[PDB]
């Protein structure tokens, strides 16, 4: 599932509302927060796997969200050394991501924090626009910067 450079393909999702906030999710068990991001199975389309983890970890069918923009390219980040598993090969060094931006055209109630018996997230809340760039783990941070940048103009439309 890894490519030749070590990166495994993933999709990230940034759900916003008309008021200009985005949805910030608490990771399961812990009290660390981050955006939804999930693995693209073999033979998945980018958009496919996106809607996949959207439903699994949010409980949102395509009727509830309106696609607003994806990124042009794949964005890469490298895990730090202490979290690299060198012995399980091929060795995953980091992730290459494609990010999509949705608008919630439904209500703040179909947000099923745990649909499956395997909930990767406890709760959620709404946050201002540039808040995640500070809060996300340090190695994720450049990716988040580029993402929120490319998305910011589009989100600044009412």
């Amino acid at each position: 599932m890894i490519d030749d450079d070590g990166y495994r393909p993933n999709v990230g999702i940034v759900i916003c509302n008309r008021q200009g906030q985005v949805m910030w999710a608490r990771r399961f068990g812990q009290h660390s927060w981050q955006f939804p991001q999930g693995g693209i199975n073999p033979g998945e389309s980018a958009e496919q796997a996106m809607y996949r983890e959207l439903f699994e970890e949010v409980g949102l069918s395509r009727k509830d969200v309106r696609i607003l923009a994806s990124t042009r390219n794949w964005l890469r980040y490298k895990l730090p050394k202490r979290l690299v598993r060198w012995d399980t090969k091929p060795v995953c060094i980091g992730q290459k991501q494609k990010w999509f931006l949705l608008q919630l055209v439904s209500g703040d109630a179909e947000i099923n924090m745990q649909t499956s018996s395997t909930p990767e997230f406890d709760g959620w809340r709404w946050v201002s626009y540039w808040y995640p760039v500070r809060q996300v783990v340090s190695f994720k941070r450049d990716v988040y910067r580029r993402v929120m940048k490319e998305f910011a103009s589009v989100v600044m439309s009412l």
């Binding site: 709404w126 626009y129 540039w130 760039v133 500070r134 910067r145 600044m156």
Partner: protein, 275 residues
Amino acid sequence: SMQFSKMHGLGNDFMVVDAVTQNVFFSPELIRRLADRHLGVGFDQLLVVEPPYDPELDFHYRIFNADGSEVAQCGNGARCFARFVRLKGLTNKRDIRVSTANGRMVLTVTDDDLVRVNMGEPNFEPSAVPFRANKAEKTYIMRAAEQTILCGVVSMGNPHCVIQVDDVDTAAVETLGPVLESHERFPERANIGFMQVVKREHIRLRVYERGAGETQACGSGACAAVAVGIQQGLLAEEVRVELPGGRLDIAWKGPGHPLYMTGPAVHVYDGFIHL
């Protein structure tokens, strides 16, 4: 390896740096090298814009002076920040909730493209200036060499001593300002303001700033002069202030109310530097 913007508010020039969409690091030494006017970019202060540190606010920002050290002044660099984040399309709001080394705050862009800045409510208690005196009074007596001066003292977070004069052009700032700044009754020194009242709604103003001398615009200085002018019955609630480098509109409704200061901010050029 960095994009910046050079701006100024009424002659107070900033280097302004987006640390929101940019990875960026500083030194006291680096900031000094950058601030130098012939060897670097040239600025009085460096203003760093950062993501908010809580989910309700919009941005956070820091200020370093050209010595290298952080500056926590209440209204410092607020209007340049406020026009910047709109200019660089980082927000499209007119009200902006911001956090600094002084706390939360809210900033309003007006239709004229000016910025209104809530400065807080002016403290007149002497022990808070600090100003050495027996009770808080509307006017005090400065025994300065052979002259006798009628001062009014206020804190905008800075220390200020405001003096009524008859024509600001005729005032002896460069001689009296230094002797009033390092006065006994000012253990932390003070900012000396020379205020000529034209009408209940219009004054002129010159400020001898702490350790620096006369400046072409002190924001807190204007705030102090209008506060003390209102507290002395001289001024109305919305005073236009003429400073050597342009105009401020101060509004304050007395004790119990904050003081609102309104001014321009000018964007001068966009620049890119390595290191």
